Assembly symmetry: D2
Homo-oligomer: 321 residues x 4
């Protein structure tokens, strides 16, 4: 059952831009994201912390918000111009989705924004205006040995990947890689607007749930340093999977778990997908190299755990099996 294709154009989406995460103990979460991982504080107060990666100039890539139930409040995408916020609102209203528009934004440093409960149950935000901050690209005096340099993508778990895929294609995302069986059925898909492998990916499973949010480092040694530092801090039990090389995406990856169990991917090595006819790489569902190029052992929790997502009232979306 495909989502209908609207008669109005999709909003012109530039890239994933930030995620709003609800955490149960802000101070313990700050230790993880700032003291362990080195993300940069744009600004913070007692209940909210705004973080950005090294090469970011928009206000933030992560908003950590204290709350009663750990969950993801919003997956935010930046659109190309103010008119595209109006386009986003019109598109989701034609789809019959719940929408909420706030001229002054939902998170600090972001202006006119529309949030929607999308067709797959996810809270998506579209915005254009954002407060610019000092871009720390060349602030090597602040560079840590495990520096996270850029926000790259989201990964969502949903029960019907083919439905999800066609919905995101209509939204303008293109598939750089997918996993299919012999009958041509899509089991997972990596989808992009910007010129990397993906801005989001759809993973088959119980959902809506947030599988992970991902940041890139400049080189492989930076990822190894994150592992080494976690070992020295005696929190290696928070390293869930990796380091490894994924066949799909070609990423050298690491998955770690924050204090509430939210999964963060840190990776490096991506490749250019910007040409109009970029060739889709289709992996067979039985090729193990799709998961691990090197054959690394399977970690069960990577296939069972994922974060709840919220609706526009701040309540968890029930997870459908």
């Amino acid at each position: 059952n495909f989502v209908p294709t609207p008669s109005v154009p999709a909003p012109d989406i530039v890239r994933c831009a930030y995620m709003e995460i609800v955490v149960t103990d802000l101070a313990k979460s700050r230790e993880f994201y700032v003291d362990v991982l080195g993300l940069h504080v744009t600004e913070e107060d007692e209940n909210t912390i705004y973080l950005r990666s090294l090469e970011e100039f928009i206000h933030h890539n992560l908003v950590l918000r204290q709350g009663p139930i750990a969950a993801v409040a919003a997956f935010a995408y930046r659109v190309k111009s103010p008119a595209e916020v109006d386009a986003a609102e019109a598109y989701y209203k034609e789809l019959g989705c719940r929408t909420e528009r706030r001229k002054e934004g939902f998170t600090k440093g972001i202006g006119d924004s529309v949030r929607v409960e999308d067709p797959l149950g996810f809270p998506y935000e579209f915005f254009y205006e954002t407060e610019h901050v000092e871009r720390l690209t060349q602030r090597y005096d602040l560079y840590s040995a495990g520096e996270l340099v850029r926000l790259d993508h989201f990964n969502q778990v949903t029960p019907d990947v083919p439905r999800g895929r066609a919905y995101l294609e209509d939204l303008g995302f293109r598939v750089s890689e997918d996993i299919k069986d012999s009958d041509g059925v899509t089991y997972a898909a990596w989808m992009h607007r910007k010129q990397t492998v993906h801005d989001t990916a759809l993973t088959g499973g119980n959902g809506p749930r947030m599988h992970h949010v991902a940041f890139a480092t400049h080189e492989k040694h930076n990822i190894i340093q994150i592992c080494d530092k976690m070992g020295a801090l005696r929190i290696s039990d928070r390293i869930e999977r990796g380091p490894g090389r994924h066949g799909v995406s070609n990423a050298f990856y690491l998955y770690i778990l924050d204090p509430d169990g939210h999964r963060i991917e840190i990776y490096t090595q991506d490749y250019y997908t910007g040409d109009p006819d970029n060739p889709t790489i289709t992996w067979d569902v039985h090729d193990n190299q799709r998961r691990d190029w090197w054959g690394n052992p399977v970690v069960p929790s990577w296939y069972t755990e994922a974060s709840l997502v919220l609706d526009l009232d701040g309540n968890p979306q029930p997870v459908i099996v």
Copy 2:
């Protein structure tokens, strides 16, 4: 400044720089540099022409080496977004009064319908959409060399009037990610992009038209260091012109080397995302030395005096305006 007119018709929708056609005087000696020393991958070749691509490329080639009498650059080729944009490119340059030549079957093997033009700054530009796809070698780690060149990134052009050049490329849709200006606001150099990296081409002020360099990226810094180590072992370190260093403008960890005819190749790593619509332009002052070298590396005079000739559409060098 005599600015190039802004045409009444839309600029072609340019996706990225895509390849350069370089004329070399001794093809076998050039093949030893680009293939045996640098490891670029041969798409196909014959007695007079070699088609090369980088590791992560799927279009037919990123460099064409063509045997010829005078070392020079025959074409700077950009890939456009659809077949219709080749028609748009031809109409745009015809309105500007520039010489154009259209070939439905292409000018280089593996490329289809193309238009070449002698642009307003005297450079041979090509716009094409169609290209033969080849095996994308991204995950062919069995072919991966210690100094592997993974992607073609950009061109760098020398022209006498940078303000004229900048406004012409802005009209063509390129945006400025970084520039060098004086206190009065005059542009001395500019880095301009269509794809989401620092640049697809840059303008350097000087006698021109000339080609300053063509650049490839590696995955990491150690790959660049290995190119220098290998050139030292082969006793060709005198072909290392400048670097390794870190440029303040672009933030690139760079290396400039010279091919057998003196054509300059940049190998670099580290770039950053410029795809947002309001990406902030970084303006460097003309007197900030760190714009050239973040670490203060000594100036190499040839980098400011030598650059390659470019050809007109008849295959003859364009005169250098001094």
Copy 3:
């Protein structure tokens, strides 16, 4: 514990582990793994034997691959400080009542006067001083592979009685850089060195004598990652047994892979200096999981069950004591 007697004569002055002689069942298939996949350099070879060395080696070889009926290790060879120390080695092991064999012209090509012994733990040990020097390829960056193995570092042996083994190697002059003990002080494993790195050999408790692995170093971490990437591209990733990971004991960034006969090769990088006379021994508790994996990587069962047979001086396998 039945300790090996401490001889009345001095132990031979051992400089470092130097090479291992490995018997393989299909020499051509083994050559494809060690030379085509791993890039080790061929010193010389013939139809039945291949002599290999790492990039920075100047002695004749670090590995000898010998075709034979049963895959096993024929010798663990250590280089001693002078010709006189070969005489010292022979006298030491004869006093211990061990079988010895002395060959003035060596047991493997490129090695001179050597003594081999069936040591107190059942292992075939060789001590030699003289070796043919070959081109040290340290700066041959034109031959440098992306996953280059630069140096032979150590052996790792499985034996049933680690306390007996440790005291025997201490008497031979090896010092313990790190060990694993329980609250009672019993040694479960020990890393022992003569040269100034963490170890030349290590003792692992288990059925033995068996050879757990032989290890080579790379210059940097990315070189190890490239070995895994290349094995993935060649569709031989099932020969990657364990890693990459960081061991707490030794601090090594490691990778264990398996040759065609199942012999285990460690490739690692990062070691530290142990040459001071009072270098502090790091004792890890048997229940500290980080001793095995600093990052907590999952346990690979085969790493604790599989290890290679070793041969006696007649070329027959030494029985495994269980």
Copy 4:
């Protein structure tokens, strides 16, 4: 004119171990060594700072001492046992050199020591006893992106290299590499006791002067980070030479200058020299690759500037041309 070979044995030297440097403004020097370079403070007071590298367990690798004239007070070598301190004293006394023995040491954390004005005018110290401190090898929580992991060597400028070479050979050092002309005359030599390329090197020139003291990093990217951080701190004019690859030693190198002009080499990649017949690599004096494998331009100051050294009274040794 060779230094005579003593009838008593040379002290059994293990490795170079630390350098005592006099600086004119301790606070400005602390900013360089600790805040810029990340060396670890063992202990410090108002007039002296004791620093060590990441993998060191002896008390220190550098002692920074406030004083009126920037200079090097001592090049210290660790010997193999307490008896070797007696051996060192006997050896230099037979050579007619000035000696001073202090059972309680010259610098904190070092025990019984003998200092000597050696035959080439350098202040050398030999000691065995030292206070052990926490070895920070696995303290990845303290690891900086440009971490200096080990002290490797000293490099001295002296007018007569052949005299210097034979003197250090008699002392037990072996030559791993040298630079000679066609007649076989030694112009420079790299000499070692431990199993790396060198513990000291002799450079021909006006002396006695200290050319540089060197620390290793784990990998090349750590050296590039030091350069990047110095650029961000707008102190790139303190980067004197590099990064480059030396042909002699095969080191990937960087030379920087502290606040008083003292030269510090940071490098990586060395190779094993421990076998008894390790082959000496002799470079011709006209092979430019001996200096720079890549051909990097010559930096004049690297051949003209070097630090004064002190005598046992704390006064500068006059520099002989």
